[PDB]
Design a protein around this ligand. Structure first.
Ligand SMILES: [Fe+3]
Ligand SMILES: [Fe+3]
Ligand SMILES: [Fe+3]
Ligand SMILES: [Fe+3]
Ligand SMILES: [O-]
Ligand SMILES: [O-]
Ligand SMILES: [O-]
Ligand SMILES: [O-]
Lengths: 322, 83, 491, 322, 491, 83
């Protein structure tokens, strides 16, 4: 008879007793057991073909993708511990800054800036959500998927903040069109077309590795520097303390997405040729990001400096991974 | 050597039974019974084991041999008690 | 102050736009979205009845885990598992192995909707769905992991769905068809409406009662907690079905429901059926598998389908009859072939059990009873070797379950055979075959375990060979749950 | 045999099935069972004499003090639910405003204001804590005691915020004396002597009813309007967003103390003569409060207006009870 | 970023100042502070070893309640209480009645320190202490409240300490002396050092093991959780004692420890002793009351007292001997007078029990065994009426417990009588009397139940009258726990 | 009528026993025995019940009456077996 083990069989050679994270997150996808027939059906089904093309045939390659480890070690249980604290903080701000009539103290000019540059953030944030939720479903290993899982929820977190603040702004300034106008702005405002083009295109990059790259390494850096870093400094300087705070709060999430993305890249660089594969994808996408940041920030106050600082801050994210 | 699917009278399940192309229906019936009689079905020694094609109810003579029956590999065969 | 949810909720799902830099079909490829000719604007009528927002979710679900994890730590050192009825322990080992990784896979099925549904309401709900099955998968691993030192069987909580053991193949066959390999709208119908709302909601409820009845409060709390998450994502198929009916697509909707319900039922007949009527000890049995099915699953479907503008499936009356039969088949097959599974099946044919079985299913002793008479005589008479098999059963090509039915004085076992492109397929039921005929390209070149045996893929090509191919060894290979204790009653 | 009841025996005539609050909070003090001998010892012990004098012989009178009900219905379990959320919000602010170098952006003048007017808040807040903790131990009923219980913890909450911020300020401005100087300021600064005198005196009012009055009806209103309302508006207007926020956060507690105090007074007014007893205690103490607010706010910027607004806001608390 | 606790902790307790508008003695009256001639500045050396701040407290303690309340809701409908060993149910009914309202009163004892201690460290720790006993009191009411419909006995969870039932008077006698009627520093020594650190910490630990051993996981979790709160406020007396020793006051400190330990021990001998050696079924008994006392309570005191610069109390060797005796007394008294209590005492003198008792206490059968022989013969011979009393026992004037000791072939029952100001007092032990002689003004005109009976205060002046005065009626009046089941073993 | 505290030989507990000032030690001893003999102590019919003052060990003659013994109300008395 086979003897009972100390831990799961797939983890039995380890030396350190496995963590809760290792126990509940590792080696869970089963469609990678049979590369020739991922799913327990006919091998010519469209979805069979999709996974073979966009997951197995990716030029980003590793012998053991299951070895990946979220450096933050998130599980569902500790995801909700963390984000519940963070949400008590942000809903704290909403509750208390309202009580105090914060939206009433903003200038007419700044209110006009919010309709054009902020509210209209619900489409881009929902599009990141769709973006990360695609990485989840095509990534080659459950630990990679999970990072995308929790990231997808953060992106919905941001969309949710924005939708909430949008209604508060519509309550306080009914004649501005908050909540009614955002689609036309996203669709037609020059300031947004740079981003819209970047995200629409990235959203049809099906290769798991190119998806990771376009969404996590290229687009998000650009979106985070433009919308969180740059609009938030501007907010703080213009009397909007809520948004200055809200944005720094969401940037905690963005930071954590970067830590896992950087870990992934670190792991990819273990294998000859992956840096070049990654650099080639970056080179294809970076120009779209440039356009995106240019069109958005150039229309901000102090437009040119915000372009320079965002450009170099988002390139810095990738520089630091190699 | 030739696979068939045995649906034995009064059993609950169809089973895979390798037979020979040179076997008689009688000898098919014996190869099937082994997997049913005294595991899940009671012997009926006042009775005779007959073979019929499951799909259409055709009865095979005790003596006809597999090679002559025009079975499809894996064809399903009733194994019935008669006299 | 805070807003009331009602006032801003709609803004969370006002996320559709008209693409420009890429086309709609490129952004929403049909094979993933299944929008079915119905417009973006018509998909926008989609209105989920149970609403929730991010801060509510992270808050409530933190509470749920607090509680469940705490009940687990509290009861851990008492070791209920070392003194539980072995029919019960076996119910748990079966549950985890079949379910934990399919739960986790369900978050990908949810991700499918989250990216590819045209209904913004669906994309956000599916995102919570995605988180929910992440939770179900993870917690259904953390729990059995408590027991890894008690038996190698508990390792199958993780390993099962990685193997070609036959039950795992039946599981994958179901789950991949329902939720991993279909367009977003089909996932919404086939998984969330038909399987989750139709079966697993009520199942988990009964499963929790049963754990409690066994005096297993860790597992009762686990299952009970998971169950509270169901309806938040289970609701998703309903609104889809409304949209398809209201536009030109009732038949397509109907046909997907038809398929999903039959396939779920077949899985359910081997995973729940046997455990209800045979693994649970006698004095814990509240109602029969058939009773449970009629009261808690079948009236509900009729109710649902009437409200949606749909029909009862063509096979409904047959489905009704089979509640007397199929699961007795599945139990007999599982126990007879018990070394091919990773739990210890409980025979459950003691004299008291057999009168129970006869009350609940008139005719049982004169049909099902016959095979067990013979099994029994053999064990009484020291011939245990005639109570384990020397061949494989015939597997259905759709459900990947053995083809079994009524034996004994009312023998009625049938094969619903089909010849298609030079190959012969075997089906367990008329509905199983019809699932294949409506969509043969989706099943054609799949091979069941038997096909694989016959083709030379299992080597050595014998029973020991098939055990190794299914990753089974002594230590996990199943045997009689009460170690043949019930045989003493007959001597 | 006596039959089992639906609820506790002391609650059995009620019509509405009792709440968790009623179940765990009511009729718990036992020293009121024997007014002639509160404690199970010799009846001439100093503590026997203390409770007879300061609890039973109080001129504030009711036949059934156990009938009192916290309108907020706090129990320990729901106290910590509430204050944990509130603390995730306030520690949120501390964490995030630091990350952002908030203390570095304050002017030298405002920093000097904080050393004199804010930090020095740890003594007054600890003295309220001692104040409420005395009400707890001498009040005639467990439901009155409990309100004082949770209030005592809030007062420690405020002391704790202040001690924390004091160290952060000392880290950022080492040469100011933050943390070393507060005792001498509290002890010798004219701005504080008004308060110091009020609280030192109120702290030796042993009668439970006079304690309630001096601490909850008179002093706290004065402390809350001066330190939270007035210093916090000033903070917000001077660039200190942390303290503007911290203070509005602590005023949520102060609000809740007022709700129970007002409930108590409502209950006292059911009995002839209690209004006059209360008014006489208010009249004795109100002048000290006046002095306190005068000495503190007069030294603030815009000193005279802050005196007028605080004076009338704290009188308004008592006006609204009758 | 956040600071590290170490960096700012001291500022939380830098709260002392020099009063001006009132004097130090007015602000800190000696009868409440007990500063004892030792200066404000010397009280400032007080340094609690276990540190905690408000945000940590509210956070951790929210988690604790989450868990405990959740385990309670989870197990509620299984009704373990309706099938528990009745010796166990009785242990619970005793525990709640004696303890719930004294816990709550302890928050006032904590408030005493919070207002009146001169040590700022003590005032803040006592504030958390205050919150902790608020929690203990409340949760020890919410829990038994679950059972009010099962029996009127559960109402005593609330009612007991409101009555003059004799056990309640013994409880109040203890608690009021230790913690309700002393100066702040004395409370810190007498309650937190001597009683909480000395006895209830280890007790609650054993009490939790025992619940688990009985298969009562609600109560095990309850008790276990309360226990995790103890040390945060229990620590308070230690630093006090250091300060008194280091200044001119070792004797005063010594004498307060001496008193607190004896009084705690006496209460413990009736509340824990009997339940350990007689209510717990045989096969659950890990160690004897005496063993538990030596390993978990007595070595600890010696350890503590050596580190503080203190001596073992003058009565130590006597205390040692009495571990063989006192609690057998208290159990016999409680069972013999069982209608005067609100739980059903378990006799626990079955033959198997008596050999256990003889292993654990050599001489038992030839001393304690004699009385039970006679009780037993009477029950065997249909004379149950000789197994209930027709008089009151003599009560000790200090501990308010009956004056009992070794009977049988080694009879050794003594009264430590004292005549003082024309009144005769009775004491259960030499230490009981000495507690009165060092401080007679604090006990003089107190009357025990017997004194009250003798003075005409109980009317009618008979046993039924004394039952009504103690608020006892049928339905709560105690009787034999297993309804005399154990008598069958003797016939 | 006069309270005393009975510490009966071989019992485990002292008890309150009302006696009469007119009783003999013998009759005190009988009033005490009622609360001890055949409840918790075995009869000793070869023996005689004697009364001694607990505090100092003074033995009272069987025949001396309570009124003459100089007891304090509630005084504690040993009830011993002798011959
Ligand atoms: Fe699930
Ligand atoms: Fe689900
Ligand atoms: Fe406590
Ligand atoms: Fe305590
Ligand atoms: O699921
Ligand atoms: O689920
Ligand atoms: O305590
Ligand atoms: O405690």
């Amino acid at each position: 008879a086979l003897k009972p083990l100390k831990t799961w069989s797939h983890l039995a050679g380890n030396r350190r007793r496995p963590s809760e994270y290792e126990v509940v997150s590792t080696n869970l996808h089963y469609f990678t057991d049979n590369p020739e027939r991922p799913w327990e059906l006919d091998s010519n089904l469209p979805m069979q073909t999709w996974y073979k093309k966009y997951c197995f045939d990716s030029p980003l390659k590793h012998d053991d993708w299951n070895a990946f480890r979220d450096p933050d070690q998130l599980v569902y249980r500790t995801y909700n511990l963390l984000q519940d604290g963070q949400e008590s903080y942000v809903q704290g701000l909403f509750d208390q800054l309202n009580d105090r009539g914060h939206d009433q103290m903003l200038t007419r000019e700044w209110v006009e800036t919010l309709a054009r540059f902020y509210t209209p953030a619900r489409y881009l944030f929902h599009a990141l959500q769709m973006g990360s939720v695609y990485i989840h479903q095509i990534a080659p290993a459950s630990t990679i998927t999970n990072c995308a899982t929790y990231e997808t929820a953060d992106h919905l977190r941001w969309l949710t903040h924005t939708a909430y603040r949008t209604r508060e702004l519509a309550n306080c300034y009914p004649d501005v069109g908050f909540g009614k106008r955002e689609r036309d702005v996203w669709e037609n405002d020059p300031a947004w077309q740079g981003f819209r083009e970047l995200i629409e295109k990235a959203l049809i990059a099906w290769d798991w590795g190119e998806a990771f790259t376009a969404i996590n390494l290229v687009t998000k850096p650009a979106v985070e520097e433009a919308l969180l870093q740059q609009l938030g400094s501007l907010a703080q300087s213009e009397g909007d303390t809520l948004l200055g705070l809200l944005a720094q709060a969401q940037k905690r999430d963005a930071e954590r997405h970067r830590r896992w993305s950087s870990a992934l890249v670190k792991m990819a660089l273990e294998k000859e040729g992956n840096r070049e594969v990654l650099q080639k994808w970056v080179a294809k996408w970076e120009p779209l990001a440039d356009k995106a940041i240019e069109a958005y920030c150039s229309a901000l106050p102090d437009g040119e400096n915000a372009i320079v600082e965002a450009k170099s801050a988002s390139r810095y994210v990738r520089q630091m991974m190699g | 050597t030739f696979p068939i699917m045995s649906n034995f009278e009064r059993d609950f399940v169809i089973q895979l039974v390798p037979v020979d192309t040179e076997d008689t229906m009688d000898q098919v019936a014996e190869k099937c019974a082994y997997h049913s009689i005294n595991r899940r079905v009671h012997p009926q020694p006042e009775k005779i084991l007959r073979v019929r094609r499951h799909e259409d109810g055709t009865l095979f003579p005790r003596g006809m041999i597999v090679s002559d029956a025009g079975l499809r590999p894996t064809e399903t065969l009733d194994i019935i008690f008669m006299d | 102050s805070m807003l009331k949810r009602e006032d801003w909720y709609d803004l969370t799902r006002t996320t559709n736009w008209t693409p420009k830099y890429v086309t709609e079909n490129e952004l929403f490829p049909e094979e993933m979205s299944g929008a079915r000719g119905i417009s973006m604007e018509a998909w926008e009528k989609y209105d989920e009845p149970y609403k929730i927002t991010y801060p509510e979710y992270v808050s409530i679900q933190r509470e749920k885990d607090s509680g469940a994890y705490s009940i687990k730590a509290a009861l851990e050192r008492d070791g209920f598992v070392d003194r539980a009825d072995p029919g019960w322990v076996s119910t748990m080992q079966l549950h985890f192995g079949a379910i934990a990784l399919e739960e986790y896979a369900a978050s990908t099925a949810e991700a499918r909707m989250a990216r590819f549904a045209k209904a913004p309401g669906n994309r956000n709900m599916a995102t919570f769905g995605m988180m929910d099955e992440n939770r179900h998968g993870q917690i259904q691993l953390y729990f059995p992991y408590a027991n890894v030192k008690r038996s190698r069987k508990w390792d199958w909580a993780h390993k099962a769905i990685h193997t070609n053991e036959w039950a795992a193949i039946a599981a994958r066959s179901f789950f991949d068809d329902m939720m991993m390999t279909r367009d977003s709208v089909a996932v919404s119908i086939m998984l969330t409406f038909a399987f989750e709302t139709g079966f697993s909601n009520m199942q988990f409820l009964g499963l929790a009662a049963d754990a409690a009845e066994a005096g297993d409060h860790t597992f009762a709390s686990l299952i009970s907690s998971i169950q509270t998450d169901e309806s938040r994502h289970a609701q998703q198929g309903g609104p889809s079905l409304k949209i398809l009916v209201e536009n030109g697509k009732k038949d397509e909707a109907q046909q997907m429901v038809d398929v999903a319900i039959w396939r779920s039922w077949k899985l359910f007949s081997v995973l729940t059926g046997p455990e209800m009527d045979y693994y649970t000890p006698l004095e814990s049995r509240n109602q029969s598998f058939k009773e449970f099915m009629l009261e808690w699953i079948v009236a509900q479907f009729e109710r649902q389908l009437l409200d949606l503008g749909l029909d009862k499936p063509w096979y409904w009356d047959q489905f009704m009859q089979d509640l007397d039969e199929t699961h007795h088949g599945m139990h007999l097959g599982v126990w007879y072939w018990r070394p091919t599974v990773w739990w210890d099946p409980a025979a459950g044919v003691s004299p008291e059990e057999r009168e129970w079985l006869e009350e609940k299913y008139p005719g049982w002793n004169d049909t099902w009873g016959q095979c067990w008479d013979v099994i029994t005589d053999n064990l009484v008479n020291g011939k245990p070797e005639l109570t384990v098999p020397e061949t494989l059963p015939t597997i259905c090509n759709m459900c990947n379950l053995p083809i079994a039915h009524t034996p004994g004085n009312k023998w009625n076992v049938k094969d619903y055979q089909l010849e298609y492109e030079g190959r012969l397929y075997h089906f367990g039921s008329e509905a199983d075959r019809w699932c294949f005929q409506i969509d043969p390209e989706r099943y054609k070149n799949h091979t069941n375990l038997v096909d694989r045996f016959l083709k030379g893929e299992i080597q050595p090509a014998d029973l020991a060979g098939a055990l190794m191919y299914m990753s089974l060894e002594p230590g996990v290979m199943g045997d009689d749950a009460h170690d043949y204790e019930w045989v003493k009653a007959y001597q």
